[PDB]
Amino acid sequence: VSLGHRVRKDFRILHQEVNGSKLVYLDSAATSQKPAAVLDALQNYYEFYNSNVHRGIHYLSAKATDEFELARKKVARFINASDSREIVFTRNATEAINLVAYSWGLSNLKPGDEVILTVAEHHSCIVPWQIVSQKTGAVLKFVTLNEDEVPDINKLRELISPKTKLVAVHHVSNVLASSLPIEEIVVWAHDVGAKVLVDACQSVPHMVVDVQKLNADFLVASSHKMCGPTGIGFLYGKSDLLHSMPPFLGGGEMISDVFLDHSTYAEPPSRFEAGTPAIGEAIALGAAVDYLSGIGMPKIHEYEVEIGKYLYEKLSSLPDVRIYGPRPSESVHRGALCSFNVEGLHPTDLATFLDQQHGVAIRSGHHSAQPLHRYLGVNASARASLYFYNTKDDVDAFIVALADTVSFFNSFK
Amino acid sequence: VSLGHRVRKDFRILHQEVNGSKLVYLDSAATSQKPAAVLDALQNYYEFYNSNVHRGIHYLSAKATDEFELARKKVARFINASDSREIVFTRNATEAINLVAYSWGLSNLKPGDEVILTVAEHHSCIVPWQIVSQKTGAVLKFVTLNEDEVPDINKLRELISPKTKLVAVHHVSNVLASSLPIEEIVVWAHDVGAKVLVDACQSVPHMVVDVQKLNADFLVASSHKMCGPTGIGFLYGKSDLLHSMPPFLGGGEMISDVFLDHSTYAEPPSRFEAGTPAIGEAIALGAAVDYLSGIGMPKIHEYEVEIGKYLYEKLSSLPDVRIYGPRPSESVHRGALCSFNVEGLHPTDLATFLDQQHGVAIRSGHHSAQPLHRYLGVNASARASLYFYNTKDDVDAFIVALADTVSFFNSFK
């Protein structure tokens, strides 16, 4: 029994019919589905010990606070943070990136300072640093792709100079499925005195992530892509860096004392957590971490390797299909997703027909990476993305359905 | 059978023993408990149609998107917004206040501009404006209390001058249980060109709220206090005002087009909703709105006035008890909470004993209203706070338990 066929039972949502067909869900890169264990944890919180956290004294509040802070610890060890106080809870990675931009960026960046991105960056890792640029006078340096449709590592290294103060790049690309050598990027950046923000949204759900091994200064991720609930995500930041940073959001809970004239602030991470947090959601994210850890991130990543290659191979075997990004090898690792287009056909037509006639769920669009599509020469692409609850059977059904969809639209010549 | 005894069945969490005693929950001002209907809607989302929202072609996405946006309309209807596009989803009211402070505040407040608050303001409606003041040179004008321990409405009106640009005050106080004449205050502020932000966290869950009648410019509230999940809250704002406002958080979903050099932004409310939102939590908040509406907010308000009055009377019948805020009368109405202290005893001792020996859950501290307690001459107070699932029997148990607690600690003096 493959991993997918073993865990499929845990995910109630996959066991239904859509538009007359068995659902085939291949959009996990937009968001993941949740196992019973996570939903149980969420229900058990609300039904048995919901109360506001910290300084609540009474039994339910003490239990709520315990589990809440315990979930912070679970996330901390998942990414191997040295200290749980280096984990700050946000709504999503987007907010987490904004926290760094507002609190650290507006506080450390001067006119002339350089921030390095790639053209394959997600919008949440472009727009905040655009606004920081417009406020501070800092300049954005973009790393174009090479012949293998991945960010050019020597071009990136060339861009690292004493003017560089920040490198904000993806660990894994949500479109190209390519990875960056973060650990060595961090060394080159640190040699110059620059900080590295890692957009780890597509790596944390799918492979082992070690922030100490990476030595990254900031790392961001979203719960909803890693079998956890919507409405929570997290920011990792080195303790020393967080202690240096001013508050982002202000108000209740993040303060030490409040006077009419001024207020004093708590230390991280409470400094950056203003008002009542996503308590039940944090606790269920903890459960998602327990669930993923129970399977084993090595087991998951190795499985995604096999089904990802299988998806790449079968998709690429169709004529007129172009898959963006690198070709799989033992030197080039790919995430378990393919962004593609079919000659003469619009990806929205593909996605629509796949869903309506075959119950297959993919997405069409720029996938929040419009500049990348521009550099590739298109406005949109189709994307099939897997998680460990997908199977080879899912890929086969998708390929059959896609071949039928292509045949349909081409029949009109 | 009273409303409380009618609906208690809906709330699983109330039916348990803590510390050997039947639970008596009197901490709803800190957070509320959730009816089965809300939890079911949350579970139903995750088990059956979880998918990312907007521009998603496939069946599950279309359904999630429809329910997500329907939930936005349910919230707009609940507070009688004229347009659902005037509702912006946040993590909590604190964030919503921060949105206004950052987006509207920093781009409209100049050195010398005045912001009017009261000394009874919640920390989330104090600290963001302190920070804005520090950044723009604006100044805060605080309204003190009168002999009835409510904000001096005379001193408030007199503070209104051509220098005031914003009045940011509570609708109902989370400590005093008093209310402010918001509708009138809006008229006075608008006559000098000032905006009004209503902190409606203690009004939205407990009574009919009509933003068009109030004619408020901004209004904020948190889901977790109104039978909804943690992790979501909202900002209401007039469409013209929201349209004039620059983005707060930047990234995916809030954009129109993203280029390497700059980005354009969507219109409200998408403009202010960056990255994947708390999709499931928003849907559940809509279910909470459906639930509260099914009971009836006038019926809820009527019931809280009765049990709130009952609580005040019983508590004030105990010797050496002082309740902060105004006395209940035919002209002056209190919310269903009492913040208090007992002569010679610390409120933390009261709360701890009540929980451990009697299973009674209340709160001790400054309840994120520190300048208010300072003003009143104390560092902290005890607070018992009710919702419509509380009964007179709960109040009787509390008073019995409190009398015993007072007896215990005074037995050593």
- Same domain for A64 and A181, yes or no, is yes
Tokens (6 digits) for B140: 């805060």
Give the HSE-up count for residue A23: Cα atoms under 13 Å, Cβ half-sphere: 22
Query: How many angstroms separate the CA atoms of A121 and B250, rounded?
Result: 14
Same domain flag for B288 and B205? yes
Single-letter amino acid code for the residue at B113: D
Q: What CA–CA distance (Å, rounded) separates A249 from A244? A: 16
Residues in chain A: 413
Same domain, yes or no: B155 and B87? yes
Q: Which of A292, A247, A278, A295 lies closest to A100 in space, CA to CA?
A: A247
For chain B, the C-alpha Rg in angstroms (whole number) is: 22
Cis geometry, peptide bond prior to residue B269 (ω within 30 degrees of 0): yes
Query: Do B141 and B239 have their domain in common?
Result: yes
Write the CATH number for B303: 3.90.1150.10
Residues A65, A201 contacting (CB under 8 angstroms): no
Q: Clarify whether residues B118 and B263 are in a common domain.
A: yes
Q: Do B286 and B175 share a domain, yes or no? A: yes
Please judge whether A60 and B18 are an interchain contact, meaning their C-beta atoms are less than 8 angstroms apart.
yes
Are B374 and B36 in contact by the 8 Å Cβ rule? The answer is no
Instruction: Scan residues 106-165 of B and list those with Cβ closer than 8 Å to A.
Output: 119, 122-128, 130-131, 140, 142
Nearest by CB: B94 against A125, A222, A249:
A249
CATH number at residue B107: 3.40.640.10
* Spatial separation of the C-alpha atoms in residues A390 and A148, rounded to whole Å: 27
Interface test with A, best of B23, B47, B230, B257 (most A CBs within 10 A): B230
In this complex, do A61 and B361 lie within 8 Å of one another by their Cβ atoms? Answer: yes
Q: Are residues A321 and A218 in the same domain?
A: no
Do B127 and A250 make contact, defined as CB atoms within 8 angstroms? yes
Alpha-carbon distance A353 to B289, whole Å?
36
The answer on A202 and A331 residing in a single domain is no
The answer to whether residues B228 and B348 belong to one domain is no
Whether the Cβ atoms of residue A62 and residue B352 lie closer than 8 Å to each other: no
d(CA A318, CA A315): 6
Q: Which residues of A touch B51 (CB under 8 A)?
A: 27, 30-31, 361
- Chain centroid to CA B331: 23
Among candidate residues B23, B29, B20, B2, the one with its CA nearest the CA of residue B11:
B23
Q: Cβ B131–A43 below 8 Å, yes or no? A: no
CB A199 within 8 A of CB A122: yes
User: How far from chain centre, in Å, is Cα B37?
Assistant: 21
Torsion over CA: A110, A112, A115, A119 (sign): positive
Would you say B238 and B254 are in contact if contact means Cβ atoms under 8 Å apart?
no
Per the CB < 8 A criterion, the answer to whether B335 and B399 are in contact is no
Structural domain ending residue among the three candidates B261, B295, B329 = B295
- Written in H, E and C, the secondary structure of chain A is CCHHHHHHHHCHHHCCEECCEECEECECCCCCCCCHHHHHHHHHHHHHCCCCCCCCCCHHHHHHHHHHHHHHHHHHHHCCCCCHHHEEEECCHHHHHHHHHHHHHHHHCCCCCEEEEECCCCHHHCHHHHHHHHHHCCEEEEECECCCCCECHHHHHHHCCCCEEEEEEECECCCCCCECCHHHHHHHHHCCCCEEEEECCCCCCCCCCCHHHHCCCEEEEEHHHCCCCCCCEEEEECHHHHHHCCCCCCCCCCEEEECCCCEEECCCCHHHCCCCCCHHHHHHHHHHHHHHHHHCHHHHHHHHHHHHHHHHHHHHCCCCEEECCCCCCCCCCCCCEEEEEECCCCHHHHHHHHHHHHCEECEEECCCCHHHHHHHCCCCEEEEECCCCCCHHHHHHHHHHHHHHHHHHHCCC
State the CB neighbour count (10 A cutoff) for residue A260.
16
Which is nearest to A176 in space by CA: A25, A381, A3, A330? Answer: A381
In degrees and rounded to multiples of 5, residue A382 shows phi and psi of -90, 150
Residues of B in contact with A140 (CB under 8 A): 260
Rg (CA), chain A: 22
Cα–Cα distance for residue pair A246/B168, rounded to 1 Å: 24
What distance in Å separates residue A59's CA from the closest CA in chain B? 7
The answer to whether residues B248 and B89 touch, using CB atoms and an 8 Å cutoff, is no
Q: CA angle A320-A324-A326, nearest 5°?
A: 120
Task: In whole angstroms, give the CA distance from residue A11 to residue A22.
Answer: 14
**CA of B72 to nearest chain A CA: how many angstroms apart?**
16
Domain boundary among B295, B313, B329: B295
Mutate to test the interface with B, among A127, A170, A253 (most CBs of B within 10 A): A127
Q: Which of B25, B277, B348 sits opposite A57 (nearest CB)?
A: B348
Yes or no: say if B97 and B197 are a contact pair by the CB < 8 Å rule: yes
Specify the amino acid at residue A367.
H
Across the interface, whether the CB atoms of A27 and B58 are under 8 A apart is answered: yes
Q: Which of A130, A52, A252 is nearest to B259 (CA)?
A: A130
- Chain B interface includes A330 (CB < 8 A): no
Domain extent for A140? 35-295
Task: Check if the beta carbon of residue B230 is closer than 8 Å to that of residue B34.
Answer: no
Q: Supply B110's token pair.
A: 């100049």
Total domains in the fold of chain A: 2
Q: List the one residue out of B237, B169, B171, B167 whose CA is nearest residue B202.
A: B171
* Contact assignment for A58 to B127 by CB distance below 8 Å: no
> How many angstroms separate the CA atoms of B17 and A252, rounded?
31
| Shared-domain flag, residues A279 and A341 | no
Of A266, A295, A324, which residue constitutes the final position of a domain?
A: A295
Q: In one letter, which amino acid is A61?
A: S
> What is chain B's length?
413
| Chain CA centroid to CA B132, Å | 22
In whole angstroms, give the CA distance from residue A179 to residue A177. 7
Cα distances from B133 to residues A73, B115, B218, in angstroms, run 36, 9, 19
d(CA B167, CA B114): 9
Scanning the structure block, which residue is given the tokens 């701890």? B352
Same domain, B345 and B196: no
Q: How far apart are CA A26 and CA A169, in angstroms?
A: 25
Distance from CA of B355 to the nearest CA of A (A): 5
Three-state helix/strand/coil letters over chain B: CCHHHHHHHHCHHHCCEECCEECEECECCCCCCCCHHHHHHHHHHHHHCCCCCCCCCCHHHHHHHHHHHHHHHHHHHHCCCCCHHHEEEECCHHHHHHHHHHHHHCCCCCCCCEEEEECCCCHHHCHHHHHHHHHHCCEEEEECECCCCCECHHHHHHHCCCCEEEEEEECECCCCCCECCHHHHHHHHHCCCCEEEEECCCCCCCCCCCHHHHCCCEEEEEHHHCCCCCCCEEEEECHHHHHHCCCCCCCCCCEEEECCCCEEECCCCHHHCCCCCCHHHHHHHHHHHHHHHHHCHHHHHHHHHHHHHHHHHHHHCCCCEEECCCCCCCCCCCCCEEEEEECCCCHHHHHHHHHHHHCEECEEECCCCHHHHHHHCCCCEEEEECCCCCCHHHHHHHHHHHHHHHHHHHCCC
Instruction: Give the C-alpha distances (Å, rounded to integers) separating A343 from A340, A349, A350.
Output: 10, 13, 12
Kindly state whether residues A339 and A374 are assigned to the same domain: yes
Residues B341 and B359: their CA atoms lie apart, in Å, by 20
**A361:B222 CB<8 A:** no
Q: Rounded CA gap, B373 and A344, in Å? A: 70
